[PDB]
Structure 1
Amino acid sequence: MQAIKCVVVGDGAVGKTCLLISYTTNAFPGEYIPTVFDNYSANVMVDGKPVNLGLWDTAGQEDYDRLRPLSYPQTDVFLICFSLVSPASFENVRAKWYPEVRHHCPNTPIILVGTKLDLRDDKDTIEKLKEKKLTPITYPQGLAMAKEIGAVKYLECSALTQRGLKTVFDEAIRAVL
């Protein structure tokens, strides 16, 4: 059976751990958001093809630039994530995450993922960004960033509502098959 190693990277609090929990348990963890997601494996069916999908979190390593790349060797596909309501996390796709991922893994496909989709039209969120002379990241900004870093897909999702969530991981597998 084809085995796939998928590593999830991106700024703190873009929702890496939530994304992974919400996907693997089929529900947002509302009552308490866990800090720890242990390395995960599971058989999944995609387009009539059986595959074993492995998922590794990286939360907690964001400040240690020489410890992070210990997870990168033999990765088959990367999800580089940013929050759609954090422009700083979006710019860090270009300033921090793409450069180190591509340096260590020159041939490995990248999927660019925009998280917290449910908040892009949230009144209070928009207002708080406004107070800082910012606005949410919209779809064409995502597309442009993906083209810049050579991502094979750009995808938006919400761990909270699960909108777009299964599609992210289906496409990660399709990038490898």
Structure 2
Amino acid sequence: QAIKCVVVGDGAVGKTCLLISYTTNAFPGEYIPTVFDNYSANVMVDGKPVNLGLWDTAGQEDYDRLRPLSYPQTDVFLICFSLVSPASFENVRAKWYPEVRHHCPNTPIILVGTKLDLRDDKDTIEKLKEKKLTPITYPQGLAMAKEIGAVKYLECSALTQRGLKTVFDEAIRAVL
């Protein structure tokens, strides 16, 4: 079964790394901003084989009139935000949930907190502290998910791969 999955979210949240770590079991060298890339993976979820078409989108605001072109016939959306960027988190409800629902009213949304490894990280906590900012907790993620009518909230690290397979397993489970 062919399943189309589109990934959106603010620039630098870890969309590309998420997709490349999942499909190749390797974390990308540098940070090259995505224009548009196309990945695929053969998955087995609950006894079913699936062709998972993964569509990587640009998080830069410049591509606002270009991004909705990826949206038709989408089976499941991943809206991504960094657990370590409150700003990216606020934009889940301010930008990404509205943009997805204006074009795809019904398509299931999975909300995905990325960079889980960085949540308990010393340098990062302290760097957010100096701006009177704090990492996004799990309860807040779940409330945001309910807020945007997401079908699942999941947390993962593209770096350690912690929670990474479940993201896509649940993405497929929201279509099936």
TM-score of the two chains, using structure 1 as the length reference: 0.94
Distance 1:73 1:143, change over 3 A: same
CA distance in 2, matches of 1:128, 1:5: 37
For residue 32 of structure 1, report the CA deviation from its aligned partner.
Answer: 7.3
Distance 1:101 1:50, change over 3 A: same
Stretches of structure 1 that go unaligned for 5 or more consecutive residues are none
The two structures, once aligned, show a CA RMSD in angstroms of 1.7
Contact 1:11 1:89 in 2 (8 A): yes
1:39 is aligned to: 38
Contact 1:78 1:109 in 2 (8 A): yes
For residue 63 of structure 1, report the CA deviation from its aligned partner.
Answer: 2.4
For residue 59 of structure 1, report the CA deviation from its aligned partner.
Answer: 2.4
Distance 1:23 1:127, change over 3 A: same
Contact 2:7 2:79 in 1 (8 A): yes
Q: Secondary structure of the equivalent of 1:97?
A: helix
Percent of aligned positions that are identical = 100
Distance 1:116 1:148, change over 3 A: same
1:24 is aligned to: 23
CA distance in 1, matches of 2:31, 2:9: 22
For residue 34 of structure 1, report the CA deviation from its aligned partner.
Answer: 8.2
**Runs ≥4 residues deviating over 6 A:** 31-34
For residue 90 of structure 1, report the CA deviation from its aligned partner.
Answer: 0.1
Q: Deviations over 1:54-79 (max 9, x none)?
A: 00000265323211111111100000
Identify which range, 26-35 or 120-129, moves more after superposition: 26-35
The equivalences for 1:5-20 within 5 A come to 5-20=4-19
How many residues end up aligned between the 2 structures? Answer: 176
Identify which range, 111-120 or 58-67, moves more after superposition: 58-67
Distance 1:60 1:139, change over 3 A: closer
Contact 1:43 1:50 in 2 (8 A): yes
For residue 19 of structure 1, report the CA deviation from its aligned partner.
Answer: 0.5
Contact 2:76 2:109 in 1 (8 A): yes
Stretches of structure 2 that go unaligned for 5 or more consecutive residues are none
